[PDB]
Every structure is written in structure tokens, then in C-alpha cells.
């Protein structure tokens, strides 16, 4: 069928939509835009097409292996109270007279409605369920992306999803997919694993695979298979019925309704704004790729899967033979309805492969020992940082990136300096800030950063020092390209900040001592002083 059909009703905004900055971070403010509903139509054209899916024996076999491992999982139902507590404070309200605030408080109005939505789930396993459709507001840098489409059901339903499936999507994928399951790794854990699986090959070859608009490529069959997998778990019988209902009424598809309550059409592919999205896309990606590997006689594959994002490291068969078996791999994925965006390409250097928007690089600690860490082209981070510092926003990408990319050259020299300067200037150091990690919302105290980083990256994070020439040129370039002060200018700014922080004692002094030792010249000695990287949840409406 078609991924979507349209009525012609517009995808409409809920509120005013900014698309540009209203400046000591970056000069070329021209280059930063936010996406808006103004670009919905273009995206609309890209995500809508027919899906032809041909299975084969490798598909059927990998699924059989997955269903066998899923049968070792036992999963419990979540009480209303637990499901309510997982709902973010600012999650979109219900069209039935209550908001997340009422949900979090166990207001008897929200809970009663939630009871009725659940009851109706058990009784009716057919009637499609209403979804809202929305263009996202996401900041990027020039050289333009159409806004992504987000699709999500009413708050009431979302809470039922949690009850029915939070335990499953938190617990199953790991067991089903073992070490391929990306969201069980912190960044140092992910580097360590990529690097070890690369050293483990006699003659290694790697390649990422970009599936073109993955959410569209997911078929209604795919979503029933995925259900068939959940069902292999030892479930409560009420969980079993709600899961059949949710999938048949919502996951499989349904009507799309814009912010003004008009009907935009009907979806027959993955909704992005549901609980099963990450888990769904990760299982569906692992299954197709694991099978595509077999079709292409790829020798000795290890995979890493994070939703629609896929890395494969295997034994090379020769550079010709490689290029070729990769084309077969692609044919297989295409048959399975996951055709390519960029066409995939072999790499014989781990450092050259990008996955989850990231790549492995290396530097050196105090002792000169070499250290691998995860980094990325810092353009979108800096872009969003400029946005976040200009317009006030609920989301703080900067902090997320400081946490994820603490070891990187750019996060230490630029993000850390910049934002500790603002916080010191605003006397807002003590305040918790919300940020996204593998799609879940965590409240974090910026002064905790040092221990957080020590815990997730090791102490070497505070003293890495001979960054690769490629990495240094990527940063410098991005700075010039963007109009951000070169790295030497941050060094001077950091000494100033480090100093102010040191003067305040307590945890600020630790922030200054640790975060900015790289900037001093004569170094201080840096001695020693989380259920966060377990599962993926973007679009799952989760808070911890
Ligand atoms: N040519 C490059 C480009 C980037 C990198 C690193 F930053 F990822 F290390 C290495 N070599």
C-alpha cells in the first residue's frame, strides 16, 4: 500500500513558528534556520510512496532466531501510577479535559479517563485511533531540510502504551539483539565495542547504511511481525490484548488530524510519536540487515543498530569483492522495503565510518597512552547552541552534547566555556535543566557535570591532548564556515571562566578545576571524586 494518503488539508502549526535567530558564539547568523510547517509539503512529497516487499528464506530464519530469544523474556504490566510518573511535565495535553500535570498528580479525572481508554482497548481491537500530525521545529545549519513529520496519539492512549509496553520495549530488544542493540551503550561503551569488534577481525571492513525515510519503509506487515515478536514474551493476558489492540488500531496505521482538527489523511507506516517507535525500528532494522548480510554472503558480520541507524563490521573478502557484496546487501534491503538514501560504501578505517551521527577518533591522556572517544562534525551542535542561547527554550541540546561528547575538542573548548560563562553571568549555575538522552527526558544539575563525565568517560576526559589532524581541521573548518571565534580565542575565554569558577568554591571550583584544566598551562593533578544508557525512546513521551 501507500505509506500515506493526503486529503489536501495542510499540516498546520500550533503556535508562532520562528525560523531564524533573533551572537558572540557565531557571526554568520544567516546560516542557522529552524524548520517550519511552511516546508511540510516538500517532506510530504518525500515520505509518500508505494511499498513492495518480497521476503526470502534468510528473512524467515532470522525472524525465527529472534522469536526464540524473545521467548525468554517475561514482562509485567505497569500500574497507572507508574505510567503516570513516566509522563513528561510538559507533554501535550489531552483533548479530554486534562494535561500531563493532572496525569502526574493522579487526578481522578485523568486516571478515570485513562481507565476507560484501556477498557476500550480490550473491547475494541479494530477501530483505528486518532493521531495528530505536526511539523517539527528543528535547528540546522545551511548546506535546506524540510521539517520532519511527527505523528502521535492523545495523552490518554500514550499512558496506556506505557502500561502495556514500557516493560517490553525496555527489556526485550537487548535480549533479542544482544550486543547489536545500540541503546545499551554509553558513548565510551559504544566506542569500546566498535573498536573491539574492529580489532577482532583478521582483515576488517565496515559500512554504515542509510535507509531512505525509514519510517515510510516500515510496512504494516513489519508492524505485525514486531507484534508477533512482543507476543513471544511471557505476558499478562490483559497486556496481550492491549498490545494486539494498540498495534491493530494505532501502530499499523490510522487517520492523521492537523492541529485545527481537520483530517489530513491516513497513515499505513510507522508513526514517529509512539512508544514502540525506537524498539520497532531497531528490531525491524536488525532483522532486515541481519538477513541482508546473509543474502550478500557477508563473512562474519557484527552489527550495531540504533533505530533506523545501522553499522556493519565484517571480514573483508577483497576490495572488489567487498564493493560487490555491498551492492547485493543493498538489493536485499530494497527487496525488504528498506532502500538506500546515500548508497552505502566500504571503509577500511573505523574512523571514517559515521553512525548515530558519530565517529570514533583517538587522542592521548596525561601519560601519552592512546584513547578512543566518540565525536562528530560539530555543526548542528554549535547551530543549536547559538539558537538555545538566543531564544529561551525548554530543550537544552548543548548540555546533552556536553555529556555525550565531553571528551571532544569542541565540547570542551567551546560548549563548556560558552555556557559556563552564561551561567556565571546569569547566576543560574544551581538550576536543573532538562535534556534528551536516547530520547528520554532527564533533569540535570550542570554542577554535577564533572562526576557525570568521570562516571561516563573516565578521568581521561579531562586531559585528552593530541587530537587527530582530521578532527582538528573539521573543527577549525566548521568554525570558519560558521563564523565562530577560532579555538585560540576560546582558550583565553576559558581561563577567565575557570578562574571565576575556582573563586566560588564548592562544586563550581570543581567545575573550574576539572572542565578547564586543558586551558591552564601548568596542570593541576586530577584525582577521582546512572540508569541512563539502557534503552532508546525518542517519540516515546518518556521522562525519568
Ligand atoms: N579525515 C578524518 C576526518 C575526521 C577524523 C576524526 F575526527 F573522526 F578523527 C579523522 N580523519
Coordinates of C-alpha atoms and ligand atoms in Angstrom, one line a residue:
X1 CA 0.0 0.0 0.0
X2 CA 1.0 3.6 0.2
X3 CA 2.8 4.9 3.2
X4 CA 0.3 7.9 3.3
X5 CA -2.7 9.3 1.5
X6 CA -3.5 13.0 1.7
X7 CA -6.8 14.9 1.7
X8 CA -5.1 18.3 0.8
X9 CA -5.7 19.7 4.3
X10 CA -2.5 21.4 5.4
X11 CA -0.3 20.2 8.2
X12 CA -0.8 23.3 10.4
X13 CA 1.3 24.9 13.2
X14 CA 0.0 25.1 16.8
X15 CA 1.7 28.4 17.6
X16 CA 4.1 31.1 16.1
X17 CA 6.9 29.4 14.3
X18 CA 10.4 31.1 14.4
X19 CA 12.8 30.2 11.5
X20 CA 15.9 32.3 12.3
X21 CA 18.0 33.7 15.1
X22 CA 16.8 36.9 16.7
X23 CA 26.0 36.3 18.7
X24 CA 29.4 36.0 20.5
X25 CA 29.0 32.3 19.7
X26 CA 28.6 32.8 15.9
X27 CA 28.8 35.6 13.4
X28 CA 27.1 34.0 10.4
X29 CA 23.6 34.1 11.9
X30 CA 22.3 33.9 8.3
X31 CA 23.2 30.3 8.2
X32 CA 21.1 28.9 11.1
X33 CA 17.4 28.1 10.4
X34 CA 14.6 26.3 12.1
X35 CA 12.3 24.1 10.0
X36 CA 8.6 25.0 9.9
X37 CA 5.2 23.8 8.7
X38 CA 5.9 26.1 5.7
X39 CA 8.1 23.2 4.4
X40 CA 5.6 20.4 5.3
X41 CA 4.6 19.8 1.7
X42 CA 8.1 19.0 0.5
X43 CA 8.6 16.5 3.2
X44 CA 5.1 15.2 2.4
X45 CA 6.2 14.5 -1.1
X46 CA 9.4 12.7 0.1
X47 CA 7.8 10.3 2.6
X48 CA 4.9 9.2 0.4
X49 CA 5.2 6.3 -2.0
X50 CA 4.1 2.6 -2.5
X51 CA 5.9 -0.2 -0.7
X52 CA 6.7 -3.5 -2.5
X53 CA 8.1 -6.1 -0.1
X54 CA 9.5 -9.6 -1.0
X55 CA 10.6 -11.9 1.7
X56 CA 13.0 -14.8 1.4
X57 CA 14.4 -17.7 3.4
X58 CA 17.0 -15.5 5.2
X59 CA 14.3 -13.1 6.4
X60 CA 12.2 -16.1 7.7
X61 CA 15.2 -17.7 9.5
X62 CA 16.5 -14.6 11.3
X63 CA 12.9 -13.9 12.5
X64 CA 12.7 -17.4 13.8
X65 CA 16.0 -16.8 15.8
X66 CA 14.6 -13.5 17.1
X67 CA 11.3 -15.1 18.2
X68 CA 13.2 -17.8 20.0
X69 CA 15.2 -15.3 22.1
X70 CA 12.1 -13.1 22.7
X71 CA 10.5 -16.2 24.3
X72 CA 13.0 -16.0 27.2
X73 CA 11.5 -12.6 28.2
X74 CA 9.0 -12.2 30.9
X75 CA 7.3 -8.7 31.0
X76 CA 5.0 -7.1 33.6
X77 CA 2.2 -4.6 33.1
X78 CA 2.7 -1.1 34.5
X79 CA 0.2 0.3 37.0
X80 CA -1.5 3.5 36.3
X81 CA 0.7 5.2 39.0
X82 CA 3.9 4.1 37.3
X83 CA 2.7 5.1 33.8
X84 CA 1.7 8.5 35.0
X85 CA 5.0 9.1 36.6
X86 CA 6.8 8.4 33.3
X87 CA 4.9 11.2 31.5
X88 CA 7.0 14.4 31.0
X89 CA 5.5 17.5 32.8
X90 CA 5.0 19.4 29.5
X91 CA 3.7 16.5 27.4
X92 CA 0.9 17.7 25.2
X93 CA -2.4 17.8 27.0
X94 CA -5.5 15.6 26.3
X95 CA -8.4 16.7 24.2
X96 CA -10.4 15.1 27.0
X97 CA -10.1 17.8 29.7
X98 CA -6.7 17.3 31.3
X99 CA -3.0 17.6 30.9
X100 CA 0.3 15.9 31.9
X101 CA 0.3 17.9 35.1
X102 CA -3.1 16.3 36.0
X103 CA -1.7 12.9 34.9
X104 CA 1.4 13.3 37.1
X105 CA -0.8 14.2 40.1
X106 CA -3.0 11.2 39.7
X107 CA -6.0 13.5 39.3
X108 CA -9.0 11.2 39.4
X109 CA -10.3 12.7 36.2
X110 CA -7.2 11.8 34.1
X111 CA -7.0 8.4 35.7
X112 CA -10.6 7.6 35.2
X113 CA -10.3 8.6 31.5
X114 CA -7.2 6.5 31.3
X115 CA -9.1 3.5 32.7
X116 CA -11.7 4.0 30.0
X117 CA -9.2 4.2 27.2
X118 CA -7.7 0.9 28.4
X119 CA -11.1 -0.8 28.8
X120 CA -12.0 0.3 25.3
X121 CA -8.7 -1.1 24.1
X122 CA -9.6 -4.6 25.5
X123 CA -13.1 -4.5 24.0
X124 CA -12.4 -3.0 20.6
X125 CA -9.3 -4.2 18.6
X126 CA -10.4 -2.8 15.2
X127 CA -11.3 0.9 15.3
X128 CA -8.4 3.0 14.1
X129 CA -7.3 5.5 16.7
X130 CA -6.9 9.2 16.1
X131 CA -3.4 10.7 15.7
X132 CA -2.2 14.2 15.5
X133 CA 0.2 15.2 12.8
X134 CA 2.7 18.0 13.1
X135 CA 5.8 19.6 11.6
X136 CA 8.8 19.6 13.9
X137 CA 10.9 22.7 14.8
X138 CA 14.5 21.6 14.5
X139 CA 17.5 23.8 14.1
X140 CA 20.2 23.0 11.5
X141 CA 23.0 24.9 9.5
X142 CA 22.9 25.8 5.9
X143 CA 24.4 23.5 3.3
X144 CA 17.8 23.0 3.4
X145 CA 16.0 20.3 5.2
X146 CA 12.2 20.0 5.2
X147 CA 10.6 19.8 8.6
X148 CA 10.2 16.2 9.8
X149 CA 6.6 15.0 10.4
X150 CA 5.7 13.8 13.9
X151 CA 2.6 11.7 14.4
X152 CA 1.2 11.0 17.9
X153 CA -2.0 9.9 19.7
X154 CA -3.8 11.5 22.6
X155 CA -2.2 11.6 26.1
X156 CA -4.7 9.1 27.4
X157 CA -3.6 6.5 24.9
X158 CA 0.1 7.3 25.4
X159 CA -0.3 6.4 29.1
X160 CA -1.9 3.1 28.2
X161 CA 1.0 2.4 25.8
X162 CA 3.3 2.7 28.8
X163 CA 1.2 0.3 30.8
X164 CA 1.0 -2.2 28.0
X165 CA 4.6 -2.0 26.7
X166 CA 7.1 0.1 28.7
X167 CA 8.4 -3.1 30.3
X168 CA 8.7 -4.8 26.9
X169 CA 10.4 -2.1 24.9
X170 CA 12.8 -1.5 27.9
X171 CA 13.9 -5.1 28.2
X172 CA 13.3 -7.3 25.1
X173 CA 15.5 -5.7 22.3
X174 CA 18.6 -6.2 24.4
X175 CA 17.8 -9.9 24.9
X176 CA 16.7 -10.4 21.3
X177 CA 19.6 -8.5 19.7
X178 CA 22.4 -8.8 22.3
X179 CA 25.4 -6.6 21.7
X180 CA 24.0 -5.2 18.4
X181 CA 21.4 -3.3 20.5
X182 CA 22.8 0.2 20.3
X183 CA 21.0 1.9 23.2
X184 CA 22.6 -0.3 25.9
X185 CA 25.9 1.6 25.3
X186 CA 27.1 4.9 26.8
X187 CA 29.5 6.6 24.4
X188 CA 32.6 5.1 25.9
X189 CA 30.8 1.8 25.9
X190 CA 29.9 2.3 22.2
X191 CA 33.5 3.3 21.2
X192 CA 34.9 0.4 23.2
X193 CA 32.6 -2.0 21.4
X194 CA 33.1 -0.7 17.9
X195 CA 36.8 -0.6 18.5
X196 CA 37.0 -4.1 19.9
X197 CA 34.8 -5.6 17.2
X198 CA 37.1 -3.9 14.6
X199 CA 40.3 -5.3 16.2
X200 CA 38.7 -8.7 16.4
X201 CA 38.6 -9.0 12.5
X202 CA 41.6 -10.5 10.6
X203 CA 41.0 -8.1 7.9
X204 CA 38.1 -5.7 8.8
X205 CA 35.7 -3.9 6.6
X206 CA 32.9 -1.6 7.8
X207 CA 30.0 0.3 6.3
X208 CA 27.0 2.4 7.5
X209 CA 23.7 2.1 5.7
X210 CA 21.3 5.0 5.4
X211 CA 17.8 3.8 4.8
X212 CA 15.8 6.4 2.9
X213 CA 12.9 7.7 5.1
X214 CA 12.9 4.5 7.3
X215 CA 9.5 5.3 8.9
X216 CA 7.8 5.2 5.5
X217 CA 9.6 2.0 4.5
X218 CA 8.1 0.2 7.5
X219 CA 5.2 -1.9 6.3
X220 CA 2.0 -2.9 8.1
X221 CA 3.4 -6.5 7.8
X222 CA 6.6 -5.3 9.6
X223 CA 4.5 -3.9 12.4
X224 CA 2.5 -7.2 12.8
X225 CA 5.8 -9.1 12.8
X226 CA 7.2 -6.8 15.5
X227 CA 3.9 -7.5 17.4
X228 CA 4.3 -11.2 16.8
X229 CA 7.8 -10.8 18.5
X230 CA 6.4 -8.9 21.6
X231 CA 3.8 -11.7 21.9
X232 CA 6.6 -14.3 22.3
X233 CA 7.1 -12.8 25.8
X234 CA 5.5 -14.3 28.9
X235 CA 2.8 -11.6 29.3
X236 CA -0.1 -10.9 31.5
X237 CA -3.2 -11.8 29.4
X238 CA -4.5 -8.2 29.7
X239 CA -1.2 -6.9 28.3
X240 CA -1.5 -9.4 25.5
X241 CA -4.9 -7.9 24.5
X242 CA -3.9 -4.3 24.8
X243 CA -0.8 -5.0 22.6
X244 CA -3.0 -6.6 19.8
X245 CA -5.4 -3.7 20.1
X246 CA -2.7 -0.9 20.1
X247 CA -1.0 -2.5 17.1
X248 CA -4.1 -3.0 15.0
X249 CA -5.7 0.3 15.9
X250 CA -2.6 2.6 16.0
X251 CA 0.8 1.1 15.2
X252 CA -0.3 -0.5 11.9
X253 CA -1.9 2.9 10.9
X254 CA -4.8 5.3 11.2
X255 CA -6.2 8.8 10.5
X256 CA -4.0 11.9 10.5
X257 CA -5.6 15.1 12.1
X258 CA -3.9 18.5 12.0
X259 CA -3.8 21.0 14.9
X260 CA -7.1 22.6 13.7
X261 CA -8.9 19.2 13.8
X262 CA -9.2 18.8 10.1
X263 CA -8.4 15.5 8.5
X264 CA -5.0 15.3 6.6
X265 CA -5.3 11.7 5.6
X266 CA -4.4 8.2 6.6
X267 CA -1.0 6.6 7.5
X268 CA 0.0 3.0 6.8
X269 CA 3.6 3.1 8.1
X270 CA 5.5 3.8 11.3
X271 CA 4.2 6.7 13.4
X272 CA 7.1 8.6 14.9
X273 CA 5.3 9.7 18.1
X274 CA 4.5 6.4 19.8
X275 CA 6.2 4.2 22.4
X276 CA 7.1 1.4 20.1
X277 CA 9.0 3.5 17.6
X278 CA 12.6 3.1 18.7
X279 CA 12.1 -0.5 19.6
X280 CA 10.1 -1.1 16.5
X281 CA 12.6 0.5 14.1
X282 CA 15.5 -1.2 15.9
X283 CA 14.0 -4.7 15.6
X284 CA 12.8 -4.2 12.0
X285 CA 16.3 -2.8 11.1
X286 CA 18.2 -5.6 12.8
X287 CA 16.0 -8.2 11.2
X288 CA 16.3 -6.9 7.6
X289 CA 20.0 -6.1 7.8
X290 CA 20.9 -9.4 9.6
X291 CA 19.1 -11.1 6.7
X292 CA 20.6 -8.8 4.1
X293 CA 24.0 -9.8 5.4
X294 CA 23.2 -13.5 4.7
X295 CA 21.9 -12.7 1.2
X296 CA 25.2 -11.0 0.4
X297 CA 27.3 -13.8 1.9
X298 CA 29.0 -11.2 4.0
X299 CA 31.5 -13.1 6.1
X300 CA 31.4 -12.8 9.9
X301 CA 29.3 -9.7 10.5
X302 CA 28.8 -7.8 13.8
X303 CA 26.1 -5.2 13.7
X304 CA 25.2 -2.1 15.7
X305 CA 21.6 -0.9 15.4
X306 CA 20.0 2.3 16.9
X307 CA 16.6 2.5 15.3
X308 CA 17.0 3.2 11.6
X309 CA 20.8 3.6 12.0
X310 CA 23.0 0.7 11.1
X311 CA 26.7 0.0 11.2
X312 CA 28.1 -3.3 10.0
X313 CA 31.6 -4.5 10.7
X314 CA 32.7 -7.7 9.0
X315 CA 35.7 -9.7 7.4
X316 CA 36.8 -8.2 4.1
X317 CA 36.9 -10.5 1.1
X318 CA 39.0 -8.2 -1.1
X319 CA 38.2 -4.6 -2.2
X320 CA 36.3 -5.7 -5.4
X321 CA 34.5 -8.4 -3.7
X322 CA 33.6 -6.1 -0.9
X323 CA 32.1 -3.4 -3.2
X324 CA 30.0 -6.1 -4.9
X325 CA 28.6 -7.9 -1.9
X326 CA 27.6 -4.5 -0.6
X327 CA 25.5 -4.0 -3.8
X328 CA 23.8 -7.3 -3.1
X329 CA 23.3 -6.3 0.5
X330 CA 21.5 -3.2 -0.9
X331 CA 19.3 -5.3 -3.2
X332 CA 18.3 -7.4 -0.3
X333 CA 17.4 -4.4 1.9
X334 CA 15.4 -2.9 -1.0
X335 CA 13.5 -6.1 -1.5
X336 CA 12.7 -6.0 2.2
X337 CA 11.5 -2.4 1.8
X338 CA 14.5 -0.5 3.2
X339 CA 16.1 1.1 0.1
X340 CA 19.1 3.4 0.3
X341 CA 19.4 7.1 0.7
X342 CA 23.1 7.7 0.2
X343 CA 24.3 4.4 -1.4
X344 CA 26.5 2.5 1.1
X345 CA 30.3 2.4 0.8
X346 CA 33.1 0.2 2.3
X347 CA 35.5 1.7 4.7
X348 CA 38.8 0.1 5.9
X349 CA 39.3 2.7 8.6
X350 CA 36.9 2.7 11.6
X351 CA 37.5 6.4 12.0
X352 CA 35.9 7.1 8.6
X353 CA 32.6 5.5 9.3
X354 CA 29.7 7.6 10.7
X355 CA 26.9 6.0 12.8
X356 CA 24.5 7.6 15.1
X357 CA 25.7 10.8 13.6
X358 CA 29.1 9.9 15.1
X359 CA 32.5 8.5 14.5
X360 CA 35.4 7.2 16.5
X361 CA 38.7 9.2 16.8
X362 CA 41.7 9.0 19.1
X363 CA 43.8 11.2 21.3
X364 CA 46.1 10.9 24.3
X365 CA 45.8 11.2 28.1
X366 CA 48.3 12.7 30.6
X367 CA 50.6 9.6 30.2
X368 CA 50.6 9.7 26.3
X369 CA 48.6 6.5 26.1
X370 CA 46.2 6.5 23.2
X371 CA 42.5 6.9 23.8
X372 CA 39.5 6.4 21.6
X373 CA 36.4 8.5 22.1
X374 CA 33.3 9.3 20.1
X375 CA 32.9 12.6 18.2
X376 CA 31.0 14.2 15.3
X377 CA 31.1 17.2 12.9
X378 CA 30.1 19.8 15.4
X379 CA 28.0 22.0 13.1
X380 CA 24.5 21.1 14.2
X381 CA 25.6 21.3 17.9
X382 CA 27.0 24.7 17.5
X383 CA 24.0 25.8 15.4
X384 CA 21.6 24.7 18.1
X385 CA 23.8 26.1 20.8
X386 CA 23.5 29.6 19.1
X387 CA 19.8 29.1 18.9
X388 CA 19.5 28.0 22.5
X389 CA 21.5 30.9 23.8
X390 CA 19.4 33.5 21.8
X391 CA 15.8 32.3 22.1
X392 CA 14.9 30.7 25.5
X393 CA 13.8 27.1 25.1
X394 CA 12.7 24.1 27.1
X395 CA 15.2 21.8 25.3
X396 CA 19.0 22.2 26.0
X397 CA 20.9 20.3 23.3
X398 CA 24.1 22.0 24.5
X399 CA 24.1 20.1 27.8
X400 CA 23.2 16.8 26.1
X401 CA 26.1 17.2 23.8
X402 CA 28.4 18.2 26.6
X403 CA 27.5 14.9 28.3
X404 CA 27.7 12.8 25.1
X405 CA 30.7 14.4 23.7
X406 CA 32.6 15.6 26.8
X407 CA 35.9 14.2 25.5
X408 CA 35.7 16.0 22.2
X409 CA 37.8 19.1 21.4
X410 CA 34.8 21.2 20.5
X411 CA 32.6 20.4 23.5
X412 CA 35.4 21.1 26.0
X413 CA 36.8 24.2 24.4
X414 CA 33.5 25.7 23.0
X415 CA 30.3 24.4 24.6
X416 CA 31.7 24.2 28.1
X417 CA 33.4 27.6 28.0
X418 CA 30.4 29.3 26.4
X419 CA 27.7 28.0 28.7
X420 CA 29.6 28.2 31.9
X421 CA 30.1 31.9 31.0
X422 CA 26.4 32.4 30.6
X423 CA 25.6 30.5 33.7
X424 CA 28.1 32.5 35.7
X425 CA 26.9 35.8 34.3
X426 CA 23.2 34.8 35.0
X427 CA 23.9 33.3 38.5
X428 CA 21.9 30.2 37.2
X429 CA 24.5 27.5 37.9
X430 CA 22.4 25.9 40.6
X431 CA 19.4 25.3 38.4
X432 CA 18.5 22.0 36.9
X433 CA 18.0 21.8 33.2
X434 CA 16.1 19.3 31.1
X435 CA 17.9 17.5 28.3
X436 CA 17.2 14.5 26.0
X437 CA 19.3 11.3 26.2
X438 CA 18.5 8.5 23.8
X439 CA 15.1 10.2 23.6
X440 CA 14.3 10.2 27.3
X441 CA 14.0 13.4 29.3
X442 CA 16.4 13.8 32.3
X443 CA 16.7 16.8 34.7
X444 CA 20.3 17.6 35.3
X445 CA 22.3 19.9 37.5
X446 CA 25.1 21.5 35.5
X447 CA 27.4 21.5 38.5
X448 CA 27.2 17.7 38.5
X449 CA 28.9 17.6 35.1
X450 CA 32.4 16.6 36.4
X451 CA 31.2 13.4 38.2
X452 CA 28.8 12.6 35.4
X453 CA 31.7 12.8 33.0
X454 CA 34.1 10.9 35.3
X455 CA 31.4 8.2 35.5
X456 CA 30.6 8.0 31.8
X457 CA 34.0 8.7 30.2
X458 CA 36.7 8.2 32.8
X459 CA 39.1 10.8 34.1
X460 CA 41.0 10.9 30.8
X461 CA 38.1 13.1 29.5
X462 CA 39.6 16.0 31.5
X463 CA 43.0 15.8 29.9
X464 CA 43.0 14.4 26.3
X465 CA 45.5 16.3 24.2
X466 CA 46.8 15.2 20.8
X467 CA 43.8 15.2 18.8
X468 CA 44.0 13.8 15.2
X469 CA 44.7 16.2 12.4
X470 CA 41.4 15.3 10.6
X471 CA 39.5 16.2 13.8
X472 CA 41.2 19.5 14.2
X473 CA 40.6 20.5 10.6
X474 CA 36.9 19.5 10.9
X475 CA 36.5 21.8 13.9
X476 CA 38.5 24.8 12.6
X477 CA 36.6 24.5 9.3
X478 CA 33.3 24.4 11.0
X479 CA 34.3 27.5 13.0
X480 CA 35.3 29.4 9.9
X481 CA 32.3 28.2 8.0
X482 CA 30.0 29.3 10.9
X483 CA 31.8 32.5 11.9
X484 CA 32.7 31.2 15.4
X485 CA 35.9 32.5 17.0
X486 CA 38.8 30.2 16.4
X487 CA 40.0 27.8 19.0
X488 CA 42.8 30.0 20.4
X489 CA 40.2 32.6 21.4
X490 CA 38.2 30.1 23.4
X491 CA 41.4 29.1 25.3
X492 CA 41.7 32.7 26.6
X493 CA 37.9 32.8 27.4
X494 CA 38.1 29.5 29.3
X495 CA 41.0 30.8 31.6
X496 CA 38.7 33.6 32.6
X497 CA 35.7 31.3 33.3
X498 CA 37.9 28.7 35.0
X499 CA 39.1 31.4 37.2
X500 CA 35.8 32.8 38.2
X501 CA 34.5 29.3 38.9
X502 CA 37.5 28.5 41.1
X503 CA 36.8 31.6 43.2
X504 CA 33.4 30.3 44.2
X505 CA 34.5 27.1 45.9
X506 CA 32.3 24.1 46.4
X507 CA 31.1 22.4 43.2
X508 CA 31.8 25.5 41.0
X509 CA 35.5 25.2 41.9
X510 CA 35.4 21.5 40.8
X511 CA 33.8 22.5 37.6
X512 CA 36.6 25.0 37.0
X513 CA 39.4 22.6 38.1
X514 CA 38.2 19.6 36.0
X515 CA 36.4 21.0 33.0
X516 CA 39.0 23.6 32.2
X517 CA 42.4 22.1 33.2
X518 CA 43.1 21.8 29.4
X519 CA 43.2 25.6 29.3
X520 CA 45.6 26.4 32.1
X521 CA 49.2 25.6 31.0
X522 CA 50.6 24.2 34.3
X523 CA 48.1 21.5 35.1
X524 CA 46.6 20.6 38.4
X525 CA 46.6 16.9 39.4
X526 CA 43.2 15.4 38.7
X527 CA 42.2 12.7 41.2
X528 CA 38.7 10.8 41.3
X529 CA 35.7 12.2 43.3
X530 CA 23.1 6.3 36.4
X531 CA 20.4 4.1 34.7
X532 CA 20.7 6.2 31.6
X533 CA 22.1 4.2 28.7
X534 CA 19.8 1.2 28.7
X535 CA 17.1 1.8 26.0
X536 CA 16.0 4.1 23.3
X537 CA 12.8 6.1 23.5
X538 CA 12.6 9.0 21.1
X539 CA 9.0 9.7 20.2
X540 CA 8.0 7.7 23.3
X541 CA 6.9 10.5 25.6
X542 CA 9.3 9.4 28.4
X543 CA 10.7 11.2 31.5
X544 CA 12.9 9.9 34.3
Ligands
LIG1 N1 39.9 12.5 7.7 C1 39.4 12.5 9.0 C2 38.3 13.1 9.4 C3 37.8 13.1 10.7 C4 38.6 12.3 11.6 C5 38.1 12.2 13.0 F1 37.8 13.4 13.5 F2 37.0 11.5 13.1 F3 39.1 11.6 13.7 C6 39.7 11.6 11.2 N2 40.2 11.7 9.9

